[PDB]
Structures are given as structure tokens and as C-alpha cells.
């Protein structure tokens, strides 16, 4: 039935399923360290995962998939989705990453964790990119649903591609309303989806560092994060 929804419905359904903005357990009195900051980001992410999993069930089509497929898609895109969410939140905080309302970070604070700087910069670049494109809440939710359904898709599963096409129709519909010309409609669509390529890049670089950490200095990962992590190793 996910293929019988109008563009407006798709937007509403997705906008409706939006997970809450969770708060960090950030204690501003506690002096920062390697272990604490990664412990902060790890704990926040672990709790977000629980909301994301339940947000996935509300994404049109996702439930129609076999249960084994659902697991695959999420294990593949969980970090991408965490990242595009982080980037969307930090949109109006230039030079700053809004992990949580109480955890707002700038470039120099990443240095506290080795190799964190490059990740922070790509993330900051993505948000500023969102900012000059003036990404709309309606557009964001579509992109995030696209990441979920696309990142892990590569017997005959043309259903997922059916939904993906629907979301593409939804994106175009959104831009046609905003008064964009056909040429602009296709250009912006291209611009948006190409950003996913860089979000994929940040995710893989992110995963990379997460592996190292695990079998190294032990910034304890939640049991859920550990299972998701092994899905890439």
C-alpha cells in the first residue's frame, strides 16, 4: 500500500515518523577527555539507534520487506542516518555540530580525540552545504528515507526500487511547489542525491575509526552498536 500514497501523504507520513532530538548526558562540570567525549557520542548514538529502528518501521515500504532484509538495510545505513540527522540539526549552527541541544561542538573540540577532526570537517561541510542549498525539512526526511532503502540494496527486490521511485516523485513534487522550473527541479534533485555519496564516505570513514577503537583502547560500545559495527567487519 506504500505505492498508493500521494506525494503529500508521503511527506506527512515521514514528517510524522520523525524521531525526537535526544539529549546528551553531557556534564559541563566534568573536564573533557578522550574516553568521556567518545563515551558521550557513543551513548547518545546508542539511544538514537532505538528511535531510528522504530522510525524505520514507519517508513513506507520498509515493513513490507522481509525481516532479514530490514536488518540488512539498517546495519548498512545506521551511521549514515545518524550522520545526516546530525548534519540536519547543526544546519543553523555554522562551525558547530549539534550532537544534542546540550552538546554543541566546534571543530577544535574534536581535536580532543585523535582523527576526529577530519570527520568533524566533512560533517561541518555537509551542513554548510545544506545551509547554502536551504535544505527543507520535507526534503531532509525524503533523503533520510532514501539512505535507509538504498545504502544496503546492492531474489528480485524491485519493490524497494518502487518505493525509491516514489520518494523521487515526492522530492520533485516538493520542488514544483516551491516554484522551481523543470530544469531547476532536476538540478536540485541531482545536488541532493550527490550529497548522499559524501554521507556514505563519512559513514565508512566513521566505521573505520570505530573498529580501531573497539579492539584497542576500549571506549566501551553498547551491545547494539557492537552488533551493528560487526556488520561492516
Amino acid at each position: 500500500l506504500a505505492l498508493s500514497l500521494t506525494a503529500d501523504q508521503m511527506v506527512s507520513a515521514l514528517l510524522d515518523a520523525e524521531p525526537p532530538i535526544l539529549y546528551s548526558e553531557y556534564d559541563p562540570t566534568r573536564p573533557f577527555s578522550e574516553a568521556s567525549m567518545m563515551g558521550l557520542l557513543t551513548n547518545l548514538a546508542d539511544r538514537e539507534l532505538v528511535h531510528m529502528i522504530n522510525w524505520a518501521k514507519r517508513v513506507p515500504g520498509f515493513v513490507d520487506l522481509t525481516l532479514h532484509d530490514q536488518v540488512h538495510l539498517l546495519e548498512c545505513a545506521w551511521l549514515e542516518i545518524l550522520m545526516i540527522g546530525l548534519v540536519w540539526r547543526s544546519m543553523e549552527h555554522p562551525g558547530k555540530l549539534l550532537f544534542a541541544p546540550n552538546l554543541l561542538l566546534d571543530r577544535n573540540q574534536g581535536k580532543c580525540v585523535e582523527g576526529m577532526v577530519e570527520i568533524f570537517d566533512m560533517l561541518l561541510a555537509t551542513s554548510s552545504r545544506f545551509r547554502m542549498m536551504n535544505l527543507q525539512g520535507e526534503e531532509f526526511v525524503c533523503l533520510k528515507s532514501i539512505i535507509l532503502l538504498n545504502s544496503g540494496v546492492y531474489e528480485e527486490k524491485d519493490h524497494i526500487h518502487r518505493v525509491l521511485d516514489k520518494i523521487t516523485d515526492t522530492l520533485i513534487h516538493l520542488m514544483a511547489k516551491a516554484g522551481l522550473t523543470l530544469q531547476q527541479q532536476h538540478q536540485r534533485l541531482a545536488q541532493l542525491l550527490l550529497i548522499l555519496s559524501h554521507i556514505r564516505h563519512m559513514s565508512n570513514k566513521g566505521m573505520e575509526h570505530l573498529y580501531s577503537m573497539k579492539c584497542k583502547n576500549v571506549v566501551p560500545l553498547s551491545d547494539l552498536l557492537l552488533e551493528m559495527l560487526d556488520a561492516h567487519r
Binding site: 529502528i53 524505520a56 525481516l67 536488518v71 539498517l74 551491545d223 547494539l224 552488533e227
Partner: peptide, 10 residues
């Protein structure tokens, strides 16, 4: 088995 798997059922 698999937490992600379990949570997807509830």
C-alpha cells in the same frame, strides 16, 4: 537472535 532483529519485531 541479534538485538536489531529482536527490536524489529516488538
Amino acid at each position: 537472535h541479534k538485538i536489531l532483529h529482536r527490536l524489529l519485531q516488538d
